[PDB]
Short mmCIF file of C-alpha atoms and ligand atoms in Angstrom, two decimals:
data_model
loop_
_atom_site.label_atom_id
_atom_site.label_comp_id
_atom_site.label_asym_id
_atom_site.label_seq_id
_atom_site.Cartn_x
_atom_site.Cartn_y
_atom_site.Cartn_z
CA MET A 1 107.68 106.62 125.99
CA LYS A 2 110.23 105.13 123.70
CA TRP A 3 111.47 106.50 120.45
CA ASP A 4 109.93 103.43 119.24
CA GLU A 5 106.49 104.43 120.08
CA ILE A 6 107.25 108.01 119.63
CA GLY A 7 107.33 107.25 115.47
CA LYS A 8 104.81 104.01 115.36
CA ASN A 9 102.68 107.59 116.26
CA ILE A 10 103.80 110.43 114.62
CA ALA A 11 103.82 107.40 111.41
CA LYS A 12 100.13 106.77 111.57
CA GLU A 13 98.75 110.29 112.47
CA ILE A 14 100.37 110.87 108.98
CA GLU A 15 98.88 107.82 107.84
CA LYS A 16 95.79 109.53 108.82
CA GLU A 17 95.55 112.89 107.42
CA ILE A 18 97.91 112.30 104.46
CA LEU A 19 96.45 107.97 102.82
CA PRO A 20 92.92 109.79 101.50
CA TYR A 21 95.27 112.10 99.12
CA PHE A 22 96.83 108.90 97.90
CA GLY A 23 97.20 109.74 94.03
CA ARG A 24 95.38 112.29 93.27
CA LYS A 25 97.81 114.50 92.02
CA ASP A 26 95.55 117.18 91.44
CA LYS A 27 94.70 117.89 95.10
CA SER A 28 98.79 118.56 94.74
CA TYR A 29 100.64 122.17 94.59
CA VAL A 30 103.61 123.57 94.94
CA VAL A 31 103.99 125.19 98.56
CA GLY A 32 107.59 126.10 98.45
CA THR A 33 111.01 125.06 98.14
CA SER A 34 112.84 122.95 100.35
CA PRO A 35 116.36 123.81 101.13
CA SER A 36 117.47 121.00 99.03
CA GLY A 37 117.39 122.90 96.18
CA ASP A 38 113.64 120.63 95.09
CA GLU A 39 110.46 121.90 95.39
CA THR A 40 108.28 121.61 98.10
CA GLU A 41 104.35 120.16 97.49
CA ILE A 42 101.54 120.51 100.17
CA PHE A 43 101.13 116.55 101.40
CA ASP A 44 105.17 116.59 102.45
CA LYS A 45 103.96 120.27 103.98
CA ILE A 46 101.21 118.78 105.90
CA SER A 47 103.16 115.48 106.54
CA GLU A 48 106.77 117.53 108.14
CA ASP A 49 104.01 119.88 109.42
CA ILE A 50 102.46 117.21 110.96
CA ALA A 51 106.13 115.03 112.40
CA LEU A 52 106.97 118.29 114.29
CA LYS A 53 104.00 118.96 116.37
CA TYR A 54 105.56 115.21 118.84
CA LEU A 55 108.69 116.42 117.56
CA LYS A 56 108.20 120.05 119.16
CA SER A 57 107.22 119.81 122.29
CA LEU A 58 110.54 117.27 122.61
CA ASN A 59 113.56 119.78 122.49
CA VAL A 60 115.30 117.44 120.68
CA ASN A 61 117.38 118.21 117.49
CA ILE A 62 115.65 118.38 113.89
CA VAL A 63 116.57 117.82 110.23
CA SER A 64 113.74 117.43 107.64
CA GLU A 65 113.59 117.67 103.59
CA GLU A 66 111.44 119.94 103.11
CA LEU A 67 112.16 122.78 107.14
CA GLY A 68 115.97 122.04 106.88
CA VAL A 69 117.44 121.84 110.24
CA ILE A 70 116.08 123.15 114.11
CA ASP A 71 119.23 123.01 116.12
CA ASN A 72 117.75 122.93 119.91
CA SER A 73 121.43 122.45 121.14
CA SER A 74 121.17 118.45 121.90
CA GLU A 75 122.20 115.49 122.76
CA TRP A 76 119.81 114.15 120.64
CA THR A 77 118.85 114.66 117.01
CA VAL A 78 115.26 113.48 115.23
CA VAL A 79 115.20 112.82 111.11
CA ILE A 80 112.88 112.93 109.45
CA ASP A 81 111.90 112.40 106.07
CA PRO A 82 107.47 113.01 105.72
CA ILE A 83 106.73 111.47 102.47
CA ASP A 84 110.03 109.22 100.68
CA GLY A 85 109.64 109.25 97.18
CA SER A 86 106.52 112.08 97.71
CA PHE A 87 106.43 111.59 93.84
CA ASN A 88 105.21 107.93 93.92
CA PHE A 89 102.50 108.96 95.77
CA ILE A 90 101.73 111.77 94.53
CA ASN A 91 101.57 109.89 90.39
CA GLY A 92 100.36 106.51 92.51
CA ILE A 93 102.52 104.47 92.20
CA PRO A 94 102.52 102.17 95.28
CA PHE A 95 105.78 103.20 96.97
CA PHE A 96 106.34 105.35 99.15
CA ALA A 97 107.23 105.45 103.24
CA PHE A 98 107.80 107.70 106.59
CA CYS A 99 111.70 107.88 107.69
CA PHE A 100 111.96 108.18 111.44
CA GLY A 101 116.14 107.90 111.98
CA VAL A 102 116.90 108.77 115.95
CA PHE A 103 120.51 109.82 116.50
CA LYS A 104 122.15 109.74 119.74
CA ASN A 105 125.86 112.40 119.74
CA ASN A 106 125.47 111.28 115.64
CA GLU A 107 125.50 107.72 116.94
CA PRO A 108 122.51 106.27 115.44
CA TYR A 109 120.39 105.03 117.86
CA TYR A 110 116.58 103.62 117.51
CA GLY A 111 115.58 103.97 113.67
CA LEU A 112 112.06 103.49 111.93
CA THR A 113 111.02 103.33 108.61
CA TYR A 114 106.88 103.11 107.69
CA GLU A 115 105.72 101.91 104.05
CA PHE A 116 102.18 102.91 104.20
CA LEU A 117 100.27 100.44 101.77
CA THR A 118 101.83 97.42 103.29
CA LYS A 119 101.25 98.29 106.72
CA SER A 120 105.02 96.58 107.76
CA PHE A 121 107.01 98.99 110.16
CA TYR A 122 111.03 98.18 109.37
CA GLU A 123 112.53 99.42 113.02
CA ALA A 124 116.01 98.63 114.31
CA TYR A 125 117.95 100.05 117.35
CA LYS A 126 121.60 99.92 117.12
CA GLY A 127 122.54 97.20 118.69
CA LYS A 128 119.68 94.98 118.89
CA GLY A 129 119.01 93.78 115.70
CA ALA A 130 115.94 94.12 112.50
CA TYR A 131 112.75 93.67 112.48
CA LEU A 132 109.50 93.52 110.41
CA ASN A 133 106.35 93.93 112.27
CA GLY A 134 108.34 92.34 114.81
CA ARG A 135 110.54 90.04 112.88
CA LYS A 136 113.72 89.34 112.50
CA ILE A 137 115.52 90.02 109.21
CA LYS A 138 118.71 89.97 107.62
CA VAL A 139 120.09 90.32 103.96
CA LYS A 140 120.24 87.81 101.86
CA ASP A 141 122.22 84.93 101.00
CA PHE A 142 124.48 86.33 97.86
CA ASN A 143 124.26 84.50 95.11
CA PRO A 144 125.72 85.52 91.15
CA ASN A 145 123.02 83.82 88.92
CA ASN A 146 120.06 85.26 89.93
CA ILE A 147 121.19 88.75 91.90
CA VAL A 148 118.40 91.18 92.08
CA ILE A 149 119.05 95.26 92.04
CA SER A 150 117.86 98.50 91.90
CA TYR A 151 120.00 102.01 90.97
CA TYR A 152 120.44 105.21 90.35
CA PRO A 153 123.55 105.53 88.26
CA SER A 154 125.78 108.51 86.45
CA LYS A 155 126.40 108.97 82.47
CA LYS A 156 129.09 106.91 83.69
CA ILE A 157 128.32 103.18 83.89
CA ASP A 158 127.88 99.88 81.74
CA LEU A 159 124.65 100.28 81.42
CA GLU A 160 125.10 97.31 79.36
CA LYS A 161 128.09 95.44 81.80
CA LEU A 162 125.16 95.80 85.19
CA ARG A 163 122.38 94.27 83.08
CA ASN A 164 124.28 91.64 81.44
CA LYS A 165 125.56 90.44 85.05
CA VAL A 166 122.56 91.79 86.51
CA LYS A 167 119.90 89.68 86.42
CA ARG A 168 116.91 91.24 87.32
CA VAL A 169 116.36 94.91 87.23
CA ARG A 170 113.18 96.35 89.35
CA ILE A 171 114.02 100.59 90.08
CA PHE A 172 111.54 101.96 92.30
CA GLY A 173 111.89 106.19 93.38
CA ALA A 174 111.98 105.56 97.00
CA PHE A 175 115.38 104.93 98.24
CA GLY A 176 114.99 105.34 102.21
CA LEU A 177 112.63 102.39 101.32
CA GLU A 178 114.62 100.82 98.89
CA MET A 179 117.75 100.64 101.08
CA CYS A 180 115.11 98.90 103.31
CA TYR A 181 113.99 96.05 100.71
CA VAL A 182 117.41 94.62 101.50
CA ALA A 183 117.30 95.31 104.44
CA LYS A 184 114.96 92.76 104.86
CA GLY A 185 116.75 90.70 101.36
CA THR A 186 114.58 91.46 98.33
CA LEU A 187 117.46 93.09 96.78
CA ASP A 188 120.75 92.37 96.47
CA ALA A 189 121.64 95.84 95.82
CA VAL A 190 120.28 98.92 95.47
CA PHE A 191 123.24 102.19 95.22
CA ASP A 192 122.79 105.94 93.52
CA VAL A 193 126.14 106.96 92.34
CA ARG A 194 123.87 109.87 91.11
CA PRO A 195 125.22 112.08 94.02
CA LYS A 196 121.15 113.32 94.29
CA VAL A 197 120.06 110.97 97.57
CA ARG A 198 120.62 113.04 100.50
CA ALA A 199 120.79 112.53 104.48
CA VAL A 200 117.21 112.00 105.74
CA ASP A 201 116.82 109.55 102.86
CA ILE A 202 118.43 106.92 104.00
CA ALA A 203 118.54 107.74 107.40
CA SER A 204 116.05 106.22 109.42
CA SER A 205 116.69 103.45 107.18
CA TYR A 206 120.74 103.48 107.32
CA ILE A 207 120.82 102.17 110.80
CA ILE A 208 117.81 98.98 110.10
CA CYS A 209 120.26 98.15 107.40
CA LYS A 210 123.09 97.67 109.33
CA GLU A 211 121.55 95.97 112.09
CA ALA A 212 120.25 93.16 109.17
CA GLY A 213 123.69 92.92 107.94
CA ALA A 214 123.72 95.85 105.07
CA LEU A 215 127.14 96.64 103.16
CA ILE A 216 126.44 100.35 103.03
CA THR A 217 129.19 101.25 101.18
CA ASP A 218 130.25 104.61 99.87
CA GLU A 219 131.43 106.14 96.70
CA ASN A 220 134.83 104.35 96.36
CA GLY A 221 134.41 101.28 98.49
CA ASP A 222 134.24 103.17 102.27
CA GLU A 223 132.06 101.74 105.09
CA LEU A 224 129.77 105.24 104.49
CA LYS A 225 130.03 107.73 106.35
CA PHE A 226 127.79 110.66 106.23
CA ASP A 227 126.58 114.06 108.57
CA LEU A 228 123.54 115.34 109.19
CA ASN A 229 121.96 118.33 107.21
CA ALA A 230 119.12 119.48 104.93
CA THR A 231 121.21 119.73 102.01
CA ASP A 232 124.75 118.20 101.12
CA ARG A 233 123.55 115.27 98.21
CA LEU A 234 126.00 111.74 98.23
CA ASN A 235 127.16 109.24 96.94
CA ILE A 236 125.86 105.74 97.82
CA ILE A 237 126.19 102.08 98.07
CA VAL A 238 123.54 99.23 99.87
CA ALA A 239 124.70 95.89 99.40
CA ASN A 240 124.19 92.55 100.37
CA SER A 241 127.36 91.31 99.90
CA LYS A 242 130.86 91.48 99.80
CA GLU A 243 130.62 90.84 96.34
CA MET A 244 127.78 92.20 95.12
CA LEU A 245 129.83 95.67 96.21
CA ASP A 246 132.18 94.71 94.25
CA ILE A 247 130.17 94.40 91.07
CA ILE A 248 128.91 97.84 91.67
CA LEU A 249 133.08 98.75 92.17
CA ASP A 250 133.49 96.90 88.30
CA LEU A 251 131.34 99.26 86.95
CA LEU A 252 131.30 102.58 88.91
CA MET B 1 75.22 89.79 85.56
CA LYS B 2 77.86 91.47 83.41
CA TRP B 3 81.43 91.04 81.87
CA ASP B 4 82.51 93.47 84.60
CA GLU B 5 79.99 92.55 87.61
CA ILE B 6 82.28 88.35 86.78
CA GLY B 7 85.56 89.78 86.90
CA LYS B 8 85.74 92.07 89.66
CA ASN B 9 84.40 89.53 91.51
CA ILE B 10 86.42 86.30 90.77
CA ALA B 11 89.56 89.00 91.51
CA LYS B 12 87.23 89.54 95.17
CA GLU B 13 87.50 85.48 95.10
CA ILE B 14 91.46 85.12 94.73
CA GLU B 15 92.66 88.72 97.49
CA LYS B 16 90.79 86.80 99.95
CA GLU B 17 92.60 83.94 98.89
CA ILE B 18 96.32 84.73 98.07
CA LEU B 19 97.16 88.01 99.91
CA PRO B 20 98.02 85.80 102.12
CA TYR B 21 100.90 84.48 100.44
CA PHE B 22 102.40 88.35 99.39
CA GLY B 23 106.08 88.35 100.44
CA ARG B 24 105.52 84.06 102.12
CA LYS B 25 108.62 83.07 100.21
CA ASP B 26 108.59 80.32 102.74
CA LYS B 27 104.84 79.40 101.50
CA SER B 28 104.36 78.68 97.46
CA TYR B 29 106.20 75.33 95.69
CA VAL B 30 106.46 75.37 91.87
CA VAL B 31 104.19 72.59 90.53
CA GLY B 32 104.75 72.68 86.88
CA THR B 33 105.77 74.80 83.65
CA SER B 34 102.99 76.43 81.14
CA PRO B 35 102.93 77.13 78.27
CA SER B 36 105.14 79.59 77.80
CA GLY B 37 107.90 78.25 79.54
CA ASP B 38 107.63 79.71 83.16
CA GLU B 39 107.57 78.19 85.61
CA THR B 40 103.94 77.88 87.49
CA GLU B 41 103.72 78.55 91.68
CA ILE B 42 100.87 76.79 93.60
CA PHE B 43 100.02 81.11 94.77
CA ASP B 44 99.75 81.52 90.90
CA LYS B 45 98.11 78.05 90.07
CA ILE B 46 95.95 78.46 92.83
CA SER B 47 94.78 81.77 92.30
CA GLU B 48 94.53 80.53 88.13
CA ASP B 49 91.68 77.14 89.14
CA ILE B 50 89.44 80.35 91.40
CA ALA B 51 89.03 81.77 87.29
CA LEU B 52 88.70 78.43 86.03
CA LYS B 53 86.06 78.17 88.96
CA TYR B 54 83.79 80.72 87.40
CA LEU B 55 84.21 80.69 83.71
CA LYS B 56 83.70 77.23 83.16
CA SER B 57 80.02 77.14 83.86
CA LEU B 58 79.93 79.12 81.08
CA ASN B 59 80.68 77.70 77.41
CA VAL B 60 83.05 79.83 76.44
CA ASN B 61 86.87 79.82 75.13
CA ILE B 62 89.36 80.22 78.55
CA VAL B 63 93.04 81.01 77.69
CA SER B 64 95.23 81.11 80.38
CA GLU B 65 99.38 81.84 81.59
CA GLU B 66 99.19 78.19 84.50
CA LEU B 67 96.56 76.03 81.86
CA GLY B 68 97.05 77.27 78.91
CA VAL B 69 94.11 77.12 76.02
CA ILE B 70 91.56 75.67 77.26
CA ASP B 71 89.09 75.91 73.39
CA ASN B 72 85.29 75.80 73.37
CA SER B 73 84.68 77.31 70.06
CA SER B 74 82.63 80.03 70.91
CA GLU B 75 82.90 83.44 69.66
CA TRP B 76 83.38 84.49 73.17
CA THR B 77 87.34 84.17 74.62
CA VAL B 78 88.25 84.51 77.80
CA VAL B 79 91.82 86.21 78.68
CA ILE B 80 93.50 85.65 82.24
CA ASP B 81 96.71 86.65 84.17
CA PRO B 82 96.32 84.79 87.23
CA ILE B 83 98.42 86.81 88.85
CA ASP B 84 100.87 88.85 86.50
CA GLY B 85 103.76 89.19 88.41
CA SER B 86 104.19 86.08 90.46
CA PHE B 87 107.86 87.00 91.52
CA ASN B 88 106.57 89.91 92.58
CA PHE B 89 104.30 89.11 94.77
CA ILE B 90 105.73 86.14 96.18
CA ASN B 91 108.70 88.30 97.23
CA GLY B 92 106.89 91.50 98.72
CA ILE B 93 107.33 93.25 96.28
CA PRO B 94 103.79 95.38 96.20
CA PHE B 95 103.88 95.44 92.51
CA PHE B 96 101.29 92.45 90.69
CA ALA B 97 98.15 92.71 89.83
CA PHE B 98 94.65 90.75 87.64
CA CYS B 99 94.39 90.77 84.03
CA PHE B 100 90.78 89.64 83.02
CA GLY B 101 89.79 91.14 79.50
CA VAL B 102 87.38 90.05 77.32
CA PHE B 103 86.89 89.57 73.06
CA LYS B 104 84.31 88.83 70.49
CA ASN B 105 85.23 86.98 67.34
CA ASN B 106 88.96 88.13 67.75
CA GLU B 107 88.31 92.12 68.77
CA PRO B 108 88.61 93.92 72.37
CA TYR B 109 85.50 94.07 74.52
CA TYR B 110 85.49 94.16 78.27
CA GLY B 111 89.19 94.64 79.90
CA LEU B 112 90.38 94.30 84.02
CA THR B 113 92.72 94.66 85.66
CA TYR B 114 92.94 94.33 89.08
CA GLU B 115 95.82 95.65 91.75
CA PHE B 116 95.09 94.34 94.36
CA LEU B 117 97.48 96.44 96.49
CA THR B 118 96.06 100.08 95.46
CA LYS B 119 92.74 98.25 95.62
CA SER B 120 92.49 100.56 91.92
CA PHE B 121 90.14 98.23 89.31
CA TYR B 122 91.22 99.42 85.96
CA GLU B 123 88.35 99.08 83.18
CA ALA B 124 86.94 99.33 80.34
CA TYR B 125 84.45 98.69 77.26
CA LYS B 126 85.43 99.20 74.22
CA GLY B 127 83.97 102.86 73.36
CA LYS B 128 82.33 103.49 76.15
CA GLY B 129 85.86 104.53 78.10
CA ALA B 130 88.40 103.44 80.75
CA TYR B 131 88.34 104.29 84.24
CA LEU B 132 89.51 103.69 87.75
CA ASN B 133 87.28 103.07 89.97
CA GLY B 134 84.30 105.08 88.55
CA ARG B 135 86.94 108.39 88.00
CA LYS B 136 87.25 108.53 83.99
CA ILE B 137 91.14 107.82 84.25
CA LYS B 138 92.99 109.34 80.70
CA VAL B 139 96.27 108.95 79.44
CA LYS B 140 99.01 111.68 80.12
CA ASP B 141 99.76 114.21 76.88
CA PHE B 142 104.04 114.49 75.69
CA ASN B 143 106.55 116.85 78.16
CA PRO B 144 110.08 117.10 76.34
CA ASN B 145 111.08 117.24 79.92
CA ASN B 146 108.71 115.61 82.65
CA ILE B 147 109.96 111.74 80.37
CA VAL B 148 108.84 108.92 83.05
CA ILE B 149 109.54 105.92 80.99
CA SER B 150 109.83 102.54 82.38
CA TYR B 151 111.08 99.82 80.27
CA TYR B 152 112.21 95.63 79.37
CA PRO B 153 115.23 96.57 76.39
CA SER B 154 117.17 93.98 73.78
CA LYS B 155 121.17 94.72 74.06
CA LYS B 156 121.10 96.38 71.03
CA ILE B 157 119.10 98.98 72.94
CA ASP B 158 121.42 101.72 73.05
CA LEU B 159 120.62 102.09 77.39
CA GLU B 160 122.60 105.91 77.85
CA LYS B 161 120.98 106.79 74.82
CA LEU B 162 117.43 106.15 76.19
CA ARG B 163 118.20 106.93 79.55
CA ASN B 164 119.43 111.15 78.05
CA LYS B 165 116.28 111.52 77.25
CA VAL B 166 113.63 110.04 80.30
CA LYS B 167 113.45 112.55 83.06
CA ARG B 168 112.23 109.61 85.58
CA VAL B 169 113.11 105.95 85.19
CA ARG B 170 111.43 103.05 87.22
CA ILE B 171 111.05 99.47 86.19
CA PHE B 172 107.72 98.04 88.40
CA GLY B 173 108.21 94.13 87.39
CA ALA B 174 104.73 93.38 86.30
CA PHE B 175 104.17 95.10 82.58
CA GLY B 176 100.62 93.80 82.64
CA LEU B 177 100.08 96.36 85.35
CA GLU B 178 102.49 98.91 83.62
CA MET B 179 100.26 99.56 80.91
CA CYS B 180 97.76 100.48 83.07
CA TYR B 181 99.88 103.05 84.65
CA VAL B 182 99.96 104.85 80.64
CA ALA B 183 96.51 103.92 81.63
CA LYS B 184 95.80 106.18 84.91
CA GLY B 185 98.43 109.07 83.44
CA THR B 186 101.64 108.26 85.12
CA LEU B 187 104.58 106.54 82.62
CA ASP B 188 104.53 108.49 79.47
CA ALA B 189 105.25 104.95 77.92
CA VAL B 190 106.81 101.48 78.53
CA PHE B 191 108.66 98.83 75.99
CA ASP B 192 110.35 94.87 76.02
CA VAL B 193 111.86 94.62 73.07
CA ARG B 194 113.16 90.93 74.40
CA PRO B 195 110.18 89.33 73.73
CA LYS B 196 108.66 87.83 76.94
CA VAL B 197 105.49 89.47 77.15
CA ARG B 198 102.62 87.27 75.72
CA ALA B 199 98.67 87.42 75.66
CA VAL B 200 98.12 86.89 79.02
CA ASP B 201 100.08 89.33 80.03
CA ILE B 202 98.47 92.60 77.89
CA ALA B 203 95.38 91.38 77.04
CA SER B 204 93.44 92.73 79.83
CA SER B 205 95.11 95.53 80.01
CA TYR B 206 95.22 96.15 75.89
CA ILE B 207 91.60 96.58 75.55
CA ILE B 208 92.31 99.38 78.87
CA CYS B 209 95.23 101.76 76.74
CA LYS B 210 93.40 101.78 73.92
CA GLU B 211 89.83 102.80 74.72
CA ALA B 212 91.69 105.55 76.71
CA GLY B 213 94.19 107.15 74.03
CA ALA B 214 97.64 105.16 74.10
CA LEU B 215 99.64 103.74 71.66
CA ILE B 216 100.63 100.06 71.34
CA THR B 217 102.82 99.77 68.92
CA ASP B 218 105.37 96.76 67.26
CA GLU B 219 109.04 96.72 67.23
CA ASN B 220 108.70 99.00 64.26
CA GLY B 221 106.30 101.41 64.56
CA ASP B 222 103.07 99.12 63.71
CA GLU B 223 99.58 98.75 65.26
CA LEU B 224 100.47 95.59 67.21
CA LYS B 225 98.10 93.04 66.06
CA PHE B 226 98.63 89.93 69.01
CA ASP B 227 96.85 86.69 69.27
CA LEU B 228 95.06 84.90 72.01
CA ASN B 229 97.25 82.25 73.31
CA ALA B 230 99.82 81.13 76.31
CA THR B 231 102.87 80.56 74.38
CA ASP B 232 103.92 83.12 71.95
CA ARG B 233 106.63 86.10 73.74
CA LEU B 234 105.68 89.14 71.57
CA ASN B 235 107.52 92.69 70.97
CA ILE B 236 105.10 95.57 72.31
CA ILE B 237 104.91 99.00 72.13
CA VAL B 238 102.62 100.94 74.83
CA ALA B 239 103.13 104.69 74.68
CA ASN B 240 101.48 108.20 75.84
CA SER B 241 101.88 109.09 71.89
CA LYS B 242 103.75 109.94 69.09
CA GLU B 243 106.25 112.32 69.50
CA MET B 244 107.49 109.38 72.48
CA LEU B 245 106.95 106.36 70.19
CA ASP B 246 109.22 107.90 67.74
CA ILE B 247 111.84 108.92 70.63
CA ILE B 248 111.75 104.81 71.88
CA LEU B 249 110.93 103.57 68.04
CA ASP B 250 114.64 105.58 67.58
CA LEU B 251 117.09 104.50 70.31
CA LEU B 252 115.98 100.92 69.23
ZN1 ZN C 1 112.25 116.43 98.32
ZN1 ZN C 2 110.19 112.88 100.61
ZN1 ZN C 3 113.33 110.70 101.05
ZN1 ZN C 4 104.10 84.00 84.97
ZN1 ZN C 5 101.12 85.47 86.15
ZN1 ZN C 6 101.57 88.20 83.96
#
């Protein structure tokens, strides 16, 4: 069936066996340490684990946070984040999401991104635009006197500056779903010059975003290009416009 | 009905009326200007009314954000934020909450904080303890590494300094609902030294962090003592502890 229907299913299953778990930070514990270095906790595992029960039978290429990479030598590669911003979930903060990115010959094909608590699907096919539960969505018409951002900078960003330029901070704790807060026009921007965010985190939204006007820009100014491993941290500046980028560029 | 039976009821009303408004940016118009200078959107007003629809039958004090201070000389004041975080609400940020606080002779009695998205009920009676939908929730316990604060600071507030100590930053845009996150034990602290937070935003939850181990402190380390009004934009420090409080109290 369609990548679309394949992701929404996987989503709805994840959502099934783990939402009860939501916030219950006591029934969780570390189970392993992901290839990325990070510590893998159990509800992460049981999600990914629930995810490979579908992608395994499709013998497509695979890449996720916990598992790493399973190369079946295929045209296609399904990149998954069982939970985007685990923590938030384990600590009852209603900001996490399922990240599902499908790639054809390293080319953004389809992209799903599910926000459990809001019951919201962020899905976008390369070439066909971006939708929120079926409604077309694009970036926000920029405006200097109202910009609202998020960010996870380095020890080399004049905080006071940005805060003197930006009219509203809103840090959240799940890049992937934050990007989507850009595609649907709620934030002028979200970056991350602290090389921590990985492939898996942004992948699915990398797409979606782009189809709704995103300027996924790398540390310099260039179009953020990336790889498809479980490892490899990376910079990134999802902006809603060619000025909003700049501002980050000046701060940067 | 006890107080909490009223509180919890007034919320389920509000829920059914403003949930379909969540993110519906196109569906709401300003209707006036609240005492604190803020603007009252209709999702604001409409829910405020729903509060006054119950409490008016009763001969007590009413202190709510858009309306201000309806006073009936009783020794029973009722303080409510119809929606704590109008912004987030109407822009599809899943971080808002209902605030129902009650004090007898200017002293805490019952406080409620409803966060509709998570469906969590934050309540506390004075001396009887603070829970979340039954299960007793209690503050954290200082960790020198894992500091997870949220904040709304001033220019003077050294920022690189602060971020040098806090191991996790978040800023959800609704100080009221955020305090309860100090309640349940998620955040190690949370301030606003840029006096915008008012009575109405932190009353109802005031009673809960109090009744759950948090310290509450004006900028000068001193046990916060507010008045019961619409106007008046105060400073405030809701903290995990003292080692923390110490931390916060020095960065500024
Ligand atoms: Zn992780
Ligand atoms: Zn994750
Ligand atoms: Zn992630
Ligand atoms: Zn307001
Ligand atoms: Zn309000
Ligand atoms: Zn408020």
